[PDB]
Paper text:
The metastable nature of cleaved, fusion-competent human immunodeficiency virus (HIV)-1 envelope glycoprotein (Env) controls the critical structural rearrangements that are required for fusion between the viral and host cell membranes after sequential binding to the CD4 receptor and the CXCR4 or CCR5 co-receptor. The gp120 subunits of Env house the receptor and coreceptor-binding sites, while gp41 contains the fusion machinery. The culmination of this cell entry process is orchestrated by the fusion peptide (FP) in the gp41 subunit through its insertion into the host cell membrane. The hydrophobic FP at the N-terminus of gp41 becomes available for fusion activity after proteolytic cleavage of gp160 into gp120 and gp41 by a host cell serine protease of the Furin family.
For crystallographic studies, the B41 SOSIP.664 trimers were further stabilized by binding to Fabs PGT124 and 35O22, which increase the melting temperatures by ~5 °C (to 62.8 °C) and an additional ~1.5 °C (to 64.5 °C), respectively. The trimer-Fab complex crystallized in two different conditions, and x-ray structures were determined at 3.50 Å and at 3.80 Å resolutions in cubic (P23) and hexagonal (P63) crystal lattices with data complete to ~100% in the highest resolution shell. B41 SOSIP.664 (3.50 Å) adopts overall protomer/trimer conformations, similar to previously determined trimer structures from other isolates/clades, with Cα root mean square deviations (r.m.s.d) ranging between 0.6–1.0 Å (protomer) and 1.0–1.3 Å (trimer). The FP, which is fully resolved to A512 at the N-terminus in the P23 lattice, is in a conformation that points away from the C-terminus of gp120 and is sandwiched between HR2 of the neighboring protomer in the trimer and the light-chain (LC) variable region (CDRL1 and LFR3) of 35O22 (from another ternary complex in the crystal lattice). The FP turns upwards and is stabilized through polar (H641 and T644) and hydrophobic (L645 and V648) interactions with HR2 of the neighboring protomer in the same Env trimer. In the P23 structure, F522 exits the interface pocket and the FP and FPPR regions rotate with M530 acting as the anchor. This altered conformation due to loss of the F522 interface interaction does not otherwise perturb the gp41 prefusion state. On measuring the angle between the center of masses of Cα atoms of gp120 and gp41 sub-domains (either excluding or including the FP) of the two structures, we detected a small outward tilt (~1° and ~0.5°, respectively) in the gp120 subunits of the B41 SOSIP.664 trimer in the 3.5 Å structure compared to the 3.8 Å structure relative to gp41. Although small, this tilt angle is sufficient to induce an ~1.6 Å opening at the trimer apex. In the closed prefusion B41PGT124+35O22 structure, the FP is largely solvent exposed (and stabilized by crystal contacts) and extends away from the trimer core, whereas the FPPR faces inward as seen in all soluble Env trimers.
Numbering used by the authors:
A (entry chain B): 512 to 546, 567 to 664
B (entry chain G): 32 to 140, 151 to 184, 188 to 308, 311 to 321, 321A, 322 to 355, 357 to 400, 404 to 407, ...
C (entry chain D): 1 to 52, 52A, 53 to 72, 72A, 72B, 72C, 72D, 72E, ...
D (entry chain L): 6 to 67, 67A, 67B, 67C, 68 to 95, 95A, 95B, 95C, ...
E (entry chain E): 2 to 9, 11 to 27, 27A, 27B, 27C, 28 to 95, 95A, 96 to 106, ...
F (entry chain H): 1 to 82, 82A, 82B, 82C, 83 to 100, 100A, 100B, 100C, ...
Amino acid sequence: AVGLGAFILGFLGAAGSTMGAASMALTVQARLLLSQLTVWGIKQLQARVLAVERYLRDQQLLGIWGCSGKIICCTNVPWNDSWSNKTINEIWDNMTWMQWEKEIDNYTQHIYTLLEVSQIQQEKNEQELLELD
Amino acid sequence: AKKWVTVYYGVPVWKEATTTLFCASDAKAYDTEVHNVWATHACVPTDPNPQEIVLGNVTENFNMWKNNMVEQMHEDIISLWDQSLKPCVKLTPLCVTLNCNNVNTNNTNTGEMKNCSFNVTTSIRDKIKKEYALFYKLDVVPLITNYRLINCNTSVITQACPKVSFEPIPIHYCAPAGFAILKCNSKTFNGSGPCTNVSTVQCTHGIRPVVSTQLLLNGSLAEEEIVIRSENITDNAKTIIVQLNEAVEINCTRPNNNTRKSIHIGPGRAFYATGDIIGNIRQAHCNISKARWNETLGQIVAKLEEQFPNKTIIFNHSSGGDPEIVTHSFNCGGEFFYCNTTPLFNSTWNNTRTDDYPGEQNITLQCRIKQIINMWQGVGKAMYAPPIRGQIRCSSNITGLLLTRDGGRDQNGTETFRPGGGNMRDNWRSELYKYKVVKIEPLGIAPTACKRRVVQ
Amino acid sequence: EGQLVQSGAELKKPGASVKISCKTSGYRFNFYHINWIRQTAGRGPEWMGWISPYSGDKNLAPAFQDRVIMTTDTEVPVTSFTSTGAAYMEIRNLKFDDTGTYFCAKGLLRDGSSTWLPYLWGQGTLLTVSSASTKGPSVFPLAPSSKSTSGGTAALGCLVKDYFPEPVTVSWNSGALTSGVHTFPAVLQSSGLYSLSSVVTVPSSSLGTQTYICNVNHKPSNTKVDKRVEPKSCDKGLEV
Amino acid sequence: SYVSPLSVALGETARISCGRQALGSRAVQWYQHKPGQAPILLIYNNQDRPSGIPERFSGTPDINFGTTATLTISGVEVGDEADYYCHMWDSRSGFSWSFGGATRLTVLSQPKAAPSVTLFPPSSEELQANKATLVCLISDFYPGAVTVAWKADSSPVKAGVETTTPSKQSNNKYAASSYLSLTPEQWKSHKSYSCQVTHEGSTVEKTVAPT
Amino acid sequence: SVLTQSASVSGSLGQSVTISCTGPNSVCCSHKSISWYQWPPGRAPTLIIYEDNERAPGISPRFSGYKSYWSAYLTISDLRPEDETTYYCCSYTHNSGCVFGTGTKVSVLGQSKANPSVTLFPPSSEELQANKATLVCLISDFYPGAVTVAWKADSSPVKAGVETTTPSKQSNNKYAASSYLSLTPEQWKSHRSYSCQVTHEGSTVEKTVAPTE
Amino acid sequence: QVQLQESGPGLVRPSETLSVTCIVSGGSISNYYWTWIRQSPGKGLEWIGYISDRETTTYNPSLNSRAVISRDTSKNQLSLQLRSVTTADTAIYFCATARRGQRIYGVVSFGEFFYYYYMDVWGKGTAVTVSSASTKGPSVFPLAPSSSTSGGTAALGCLVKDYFPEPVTVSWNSGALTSGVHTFPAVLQSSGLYSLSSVVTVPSSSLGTQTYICNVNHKPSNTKVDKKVEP
Ligand SMILES: *[C@@H]1O[C@H](CO)[C@@H](O[C@@H]2O[C@H](CO)[C@@H](O[C@@H]3O[C@H](CO[C@H]4O[C@H](CO[C@H]5O[C@H](CO)[C@@H](O)[C@H](O)[C@@H]5O)[C@@H](O)[C@H](O[C@H]5O[C@H](CO)[C@@H](O)[C@H](O)[C@@H]5O)[C@@H]4O)[C@@H](O)[C@H](O[C@H]4O[C@H](CO)[C@@H](O)[C@H](O)[C@@H]4O[C@H]4O[C@H](CO)[C@@H](O)[C@H](O)[C@@H]4O)[C@@H]3O)[C@H](O)[C@H]2NC(C)=O)[C@H](O)[C@H]1NC(C)=O
Ligand SMILES: *[C@@H]1O[C@H](CO)[C@@H](O[C@@H]2O[C@H](CO)[C@@H](O)[C@H](O[C@@H]3O[C@H](CO[C@H]4O[C@H](CO[C@H]5O[C@H](CO)[C@@H](O)[C@H](O)[C@@H]5O)[C@@H](O)[C@H](O)[C@@H]4O[C@H]4O[C@H](CO)[C@@H](O)[C@H](O)[C@@H]4O)[C@@H](O)[C@H](O[C@H]4O[C@H](CO)[C@@H](O)[C@H](O)[C@@H]4O)[C@@H]3O)[C@H]2NC(C)=O)[C@H](O)[C@H]1NC(C)=O
Ligand SMILES: *[C@@H]1O[C@H](CO)[C@@H](O[C@@H]2O[C@H](CO)[C@@H](O[C@@H]3O[C@H](CO[C@H]4O[C@H](CO)[C@@H](O)[C@H](O)[C@@H]4O)[C@@H](O)[C@H](O[C@H]4O[C@H](CO)[C@@H](O)[C@H](O)[C@@H]4O[C@H]4O[C@H](CO)[C@@H](O)[C@H](O)[C@@H]4O)[C@@H]3O)[C@H](O)[C@H]2NC(C)=O)[C@H](O)[C@H]1NC(C)=O
Ligand SMILES: *[C@@H]1O[C@H](CO)[C@@H](O[C@@H]2O[C@H](CO)[C@@H](O[C@@H]3O[C@H](CO[C@H]4O[C@H](CO)[C@@H](O)[C@H](O)[C@@H]4O)[C@@H](O)[C@H](O[C@H]4O[C@H](CO)[C@@H](O)[C@H](O)[C@@H]4O)[C@@H]3O)[C@H](O)[C@H]2NC(C)=O)[C@H](O)[C@H]1NC(C)=O
Ligand SMILES: *[C@@H]1O[C@H](CO)[C@@H](O[C@@H]2O[C@H](CO)[C@@H](O[C@@H]3O[C@H](CO[C@H]4O[C@H](CO)[C@@H](O)[C@H](O)[C@@H]4O)[C@@H](O)[C@H](O)[C@@H]3O)[C@H](O)[C@H]2NC(C)=O)[C@H](O)[C@H]1NC(C)=O
Ligand SMILES: *[C@@H]1O[C@H](CO)[C@@H](O[C@@H]2O[C@H](CO)[C@@H](O[C@@H]3O[C@H](CO)[C@@H](O)[C@H](O)[C@@H]3O)[C@H](O)[C@H]2NC(C)=O)[C@H](O)[C@H]1NC(C)=O
Ligand SMILES: *[C@@H]1O[C@H](CO)[C@@H](O[C@@H]2O[C@H](CO)[C@@H](O[C@@H]3O[C@H](CO)[C@@H](O)[C@H](O)[C@@H]3O)[C@H](O)[C@H]2NC(C)=O)[C@H](O)[C@H]1NC(C)=O
Ligand SMILES: *[C@@H]1O[C@H](CO)[C@@H](O[C@@H]2O[C@H](CO)[C@@H](O[C@@H]3O[C@H](CO)[C@@H](O)[C@H](O)[C@@H]3O)[C@H](O)[C@H]2NC(C)=O)[C@H](O)[C@H]1NC(C)=O
Ligand SMILES: *[C@@H]1O[C@H](CO)[C@@H](O[C@@H]2O[C@H](CO)[C@@H](O)[C@H](O)[C@H]2NC(C)=O)[C@H](O)[C@H]1NC(C)=O
Ligand SMILES: *[C@@H]1O[C@H](CO)[C@@H](O)[C@H](O)[C@H]1NC(C)=O
Ligand SMILES: *[C@@H]1O[C@H](CO)[C@@H](O)[C@H](O)[C@H]1NC(C)=O
Ligand SMILES: *[C@@H]1O[C@H](CO)[C@@H](O)[C@H](O)[C@H]1NC(C)=O
Ligand SMILES: *[C@@H]1O[C@H](CO)[C@@H](O)[C@H](O)[C@H]1NC(C)=O
């Protein structure tokens, strides 16, 4: 509200949904931001509890990677070319997140552990080891 | 030039799944008291302006027949009936034998309303009184004494509370936070295929839960030409859902000025029966403009003739169905009409054009009315519609109609189309042919050239 | 993977027009541009224009901005990430110097600084512009000749002579025989008619177990010739 | 079963209801009958009147249901006094064979009038048949009520006296007569005979004597 | 063409070679993007260097791209037998279209010689029936680029009806060519033998056919 | 434009077949409907039945066991006969031209319409008395003028002695004189028979050479009597 011109590009983000186009202005925002014993009272309660559960799962993964409050967090785990041969320009200028997910879906479960142990498990030890002195 | 993985929260990635949605209506009770049972007063009120995101460059397969949204909506309608009839009066003490007479009128050249008399236990158990009531002919069957009620041997009977209304109110189906509804926006969408244009919405549109047989009322109109939808049109056993662009206006009435008679049958269980009729005696009917139904059937025969090269032969209707399936059953003003759709499907066309039609006469269909119904082919509790005081009048737009292609022996029998619902759920598939439920997976990893600040 | 198949070679008189097709598959037709590149012997390769199948935007070179009409058809989905498309290009007021091969090319990247770049190319649509008329070819059988006396190999084939349209197709046993076949480029006679040859090397002992038939198809004349090569030779090195 | 009465002022507007009220859409007819004369149809369709029926009469049509069928007459004169019948044809009933109950309309309020009496003696040919009857006529009297008293000489007769119940004529007045059977010897023996017609306040008398 | 490339260039087997691509300010190198295409004669070209230095997908790291403010360069390292063909550069931007250059033909030196294969065919009997006679001399499988053909009638030069094709490249990195000699049956019958003489820079192969056989 | 005339016996012996006839002069009998309505004294009008233009009968259910209606095609007349009459069947009979009307209260295809008849033309009406008793003819006596009032206005008349039935027609000079005529209603004498008379008021200037002769016509007694009235 009350934001014209100087703020209107603020609504038009850029580098976020830059992997091709299988999205729109609020394809990201339609999920992140859109939040009596009858059948509608029971079905709604299971829908609210499911929403909370699915939210805390993602944020927990983010927490156990060192990425809790972050949207774009970098990591110290290198990219193994066994997962992808392509370059940064073949990925971000030629594919959409929908089909990039479909490709790396094989190694996706593996990288999740690598994010957990190879860094934020090590970082929190290294940072505690070196803050002894 | 190195490559490190980088996590991204909020990526436009979705997978197809099924979840438990919830209702969403518009108005409540203090503006319209005791307004609905189909779309109850309890579900979340819809937001003032809906948010619809049209998804460019997106192409995804839909399927109206394998969609689980019609399965959930079907079981929501069924279960919403039990919770409403549960506390209301059961008509168990009303299967005593019935001494029935016919209605008194002059000689003609039979009757539809009848007049039955029976004795029932008063509110006091030991004492008994004899009462009279007028039950429609399709509610009594013979067994010295004439009739009994129809549903006795089959199952129990429960009278719906007169406070509730059987009005279809637009109800929305909304997916929970974390899921999404993808909506096909193509002007002529195949039954089950890829949609070139997709949108996403948190909720569906105003889907009036109109229970109807053979004809679809108050539905959604396609905006260009008409659409024929079948899971397999070469397969005769697959139902055919049709959709129109210009809906045909229908008009129906029950002219008899009935009355409401309250017969006490138990403690605080006042049963309501049709009292004596007032004024003229005449049956219920439905008017359909002949000029509009001819053009509509003219538009339907065109698309049918494009799917079949030899132009076949035009169809008739209504084989194999004794009660609810053959008639065009639909609610109006509270009573359940059962129309005879023979004036509509008695035609024959060839090379388009016309035949079997002769001005501007309203097409009239003699519609019989019942009060005992067991809906959705459900074995068990059957509802007794209470009588409606005064004269009944309604009107509706017919947007679609269900047909069924018939096949004769092996070959060369030539084919017609008997209208008939292959299942109850086919009414909902006409409104959920475009919506699909999907879940969002917003966590995406991808390689960039950034490395997190080194251990320090 | 993604593939592009153009129309066949055509012949048109100077003054008329031609419309070449380019039917794509394997990829989302709307995601990438479609370029049109021709190569004439007088000026080498020359870029004509591109069109955006998605939007409909087109960019024509100044040397083709008055005589080229590019269009595309709407994509037909195959899966959620592929489709089949069709792009067309129409050149008007053909001249003799327009003679050459014409290519359609798929774009390179969806977004960036070189999106439209010609990446996946078509197989070629040779367009000849002349005042003469189409002439069908005359096929003659080539007698077997000795290739290696100690190795026991020979060589036989067919001969195409005096045909004006440039495209030429030679197949053996309706495509059954593909190993050992060698087809040579055409020669430009002083009269303006082309001629070439096609030969296949086969063992000398294969005379009574294999049948060798060449299938020459000259589509601009709509003539199919099926000649049976006589396996009886007259070379002294092969008779031994 | 029989006929019912009704009293209406002269020149004012009248309202004749109808028995057996309608159950559905009604088609009522209204017949105007006079005893001994032919009935005349005023209204066939509930609002329609055939040619010759004056505009004074009017029926209530059943445009909206619940109305009750009433025949209304304006400017009631003596010529309107007659039996009225209401034929009831509604959709719920069958074939209404019997006509409605007659409504005996009576009118009141008129100017004064005096009758004219003409008593005549028995003729000569009557006396030849060994009989003799006196004949006393009464014409144009004000109200039906009238009492005829005979007088043989100055004494009343009281025997063999027969008088008419007054009935209305074409001139909207009533007419009546009175007879007195006698023997030829009783007619000749008396000096004179007197027929005294007492009407309302006044009393007229005619006297005739033998020759 | 305003975009000028080197006319020709050559390098040894396993050595490296460099192609130049430059032109006027309308096609200058400072502000325009330069792409490179390996365009064999007759076949569809193949992108190798999409921006100034980023190579196309699936391109060996042997191809390098460099561009100065005054000339763009393509460098082929560890040369192969298949790297001997025509190459073109394209000058463009994000919205404009390609501008192809003059072209460069790379030669691969430090090679293994290949003995040519010659085959001569006499005209068939069906051709002689139509009063036509054409000699067919085919050459293939020779690595040296050029070949010269000289026809002889009874060991005497022939200068009428001699049509020789340009040397093409074989799928096995070799080369091939063909030469035809149209004759009349009077000249074909009144001679003892005809000869197809193919001459290379290291050896001259001769094949002879006789009308008597 | 339609005139009806009733003709009948007038007297019927009990337990016999009363007959009557209704002659039509307006139009065709196969073009209209016809119905009979009798009028007994002291009771209301009674509908006994009707006949259609296609000639198929149906009668009032009370009298249906004894009434028969038939129409003649050659002669524009309507016949009505009554079997086993009593003294109740004693009545003034009316033949009337009925009209069929259709009152529709819904859709025509599903019935929802009833027919209703109305008689818009009525005949003069004939009287029929049923009794075993015989006829008695009337005798006419002249009424000499009072040799009456000032202005030379005299009043004469002609008397009709006791007659058996009330049906009586009286005319003056074969109907030539119509001004001043005033026939009085019949008085039921204790002898069981009625007796009326007529009067005429004429000027005294024409009271001498008037030659007035009143004509008394009576149908049940079959007698027509003329009488001269002179001072
Ligand atoms: C669905 O389809 C069905 C089937 O088509 C439709 O059914 C229709 O239902 C209605 C219900 O009202 C029926 O209405 C009835 O129509 C009759 C006939 O009216 C027509 O004829 C009139 C003249 O014709 C008469 O006279 C001729 C001789 O002159 C005779 O030969 C005839 O037989 C007739 O007796 C004419 O005047 C009418 O015009 C009026 O109506 C038309 C169309 O309705 C209008 O366009 C006009 O402007 C004008 O208004 C018409 O052409 C009517 O007479 C009936 O009306 C009376 O009866 C009602 C019963 O309660 C009463 O309430 C009304 O007030 C009305 O009363 C009038 O008439 C009485 C005397 O007759 C008076 O007493 C009264 O005071 C008043 O004057 C009645 O309306 C239709 O017949 C029927 N249609 C068909 C074709 O069957 C149905 O409507 C459709 N729609 C739906 C949603 O259901
Ligand atoms: C669905 O998928 C589609 C893929 O098929 C998407 O299309 C792609 O959209 C991307 C996002 O915009 C583009 O990045 C991508 O390629 C771009 O191409 C641009 C050149 O074309 C643009 O500008 C042209 C300028 O017009 C003038 O100049 C040309 C010169 O040839 C001339 O012919 C014209 O007549 C005119 O005079 C224009 O031709 C193009 O149409 C286009 O945009 C214009 O037109 C559209 C539609 O009419 C209009 O809406 C716009 O407002 C413009 O007016 C390059 O310039 C661009 O690179 C620049 O920008 C990027 C920013 O990312 C920057 O990184 C570069 O350095 C450079 O500055 C880029 O290369 C495009 N590809 C194709 C082939 O369509 C589509 O967007 C997608 N939809 C959704 C929902 O996302
Ligand atoms: C953005 O993303 C899209 C798709 O996600 C991507 O498009 C695809 O690019 C790839 C690039 O390779 C195209 O795939 C094929 O690549 C092979 C490479 O050949 C070598 O490598 C293979 C595999 O190692 C070996 O098997 C092979 O022997 C080679 O060593 C090409 O050979 C294919 O090219 C065809 O066309 C060529 C034209 O030059 C021919 O030379 C070749 O023979 C192929 O012929 C095809 O078509 C012929 C005509 O009908 C037919 O005769 C053949 O049998 C064959 O079918 C091909 O290029 C792939 O096609 C692209 N499309 C899709 C939908 O995947 C973009 O590249 C990417 N953008 C960027 C910048 O990354
Ligand atoms: C499929 O079903 C539909 C709906 O039922 C049929 O449509 C009806 O068809 C019937 C005939 O089968 C039509 O009925 C006919 O009505 C005519 C009336 O029109 C005249 O009269 C009206 C006023 O009442 C005027 O407005 C009009 O201008 C005409 O002057 C009758 O004349 C016809 O009479 C025939 O039938 C009767 C009764 O059987 C006989 O007595 C006659 O001799 C004659 O044979 C007839 O009654 C009806 O009108 C149509 N309805 C509509 C909505 O228009 C289709 O015909 C049917 N198709 C099939 C079976 O193939
Ligand atoms: C309307 O809906 C129809 C389905 O009810 C669409 O039918 C299409 O018909 C074609 C006929 O060629 C099918 O192709 C068959 O594919 C199967 C295997 O399926 C797999 O491969 C196809 C390749 O097209 C792919 O689309 C599928 O997703 C599977 O991966 C083969 O075994 C057959 O031989 C045949 O090739 C299509 O599968 C089918 N649906 C499509 C196109 O998705 C019809 O196209 C629709 N029409 C319109 C106008 O929408
Ligand atoms: C792809 O689907 C979208 C969504 O339907 C289509 O865009 C729609 O086009 C209609 C055409 O009139 C627009 O109409 C609008 O209606 C709204 C009321 O809902 C009104 O407020 C607007 O003023 C306008 O009249 C509408 O903008 C648009 N849909 C939306 C989001 O409103 C589109 O046509 C489909 N395909 C393509 C590519 O056209
Ligand atoms: C079923 O019932 C509906 C509604 O009761 C009927 O709709 C009616 O359609 C006619 C079409 O002419 C409307 O007439 C309109 O009149 C207005 C006012 O003069 C005029 O401006 C329009 O141009 C038009 O002529 C009529 O109003 C409308 N009735 C309504 C809205 O109440 C329909 O005819 C019935 N169809 C059947 C029996 O099949
Ligand atoms: C349909 O049937 C209903 C009856 O179920 C009819 O309603 C009745 O209408 C009459 C008027 O003719 C009502 O009489 C009214 O009573 C109220 C007080 O109750 C009084 O204020 C009025 O002055 C009048 O006397 C009667 O009460 C009412 N009966 C009810 C409502 O139960 C109706 O007229 C019929 N309609 C048609 C078109 O058939
Ligand atoms: C449509 O109408 C035709 C009219 O004949 C029906 O055909 C009859 O169908 C019955 C039941 O199968 C057969 O026993 C008869 O033999 C058929 N007709 C004749 C005369 O042979 C047909 O069944 C109807 N079908 C629909 C669509 O209701
Ligand atoms: C993904 O994993 C599944 C496991 O069954 C395997 O079959 C499939 O080939 C893999 N796909 C890719 C693209 O790696
Ligand atoms: C119920 O009773 C009716 C009437 O006797 C009979 O027709 C019907 O078959 C019975 N149904 C069952 C399931 O008993
Ligand atoms: C439709 O039915 C036919 C005949 O049974 C069958 O061959 C075909 O596979 C079916 N197609 C679909 C889409 O179900
Ligand atoms: C129905 O439509 C057809 C084709 O337009 C026409 O021939 C026919 O007359 C129409 N029938 C009616 C009753 O309007």
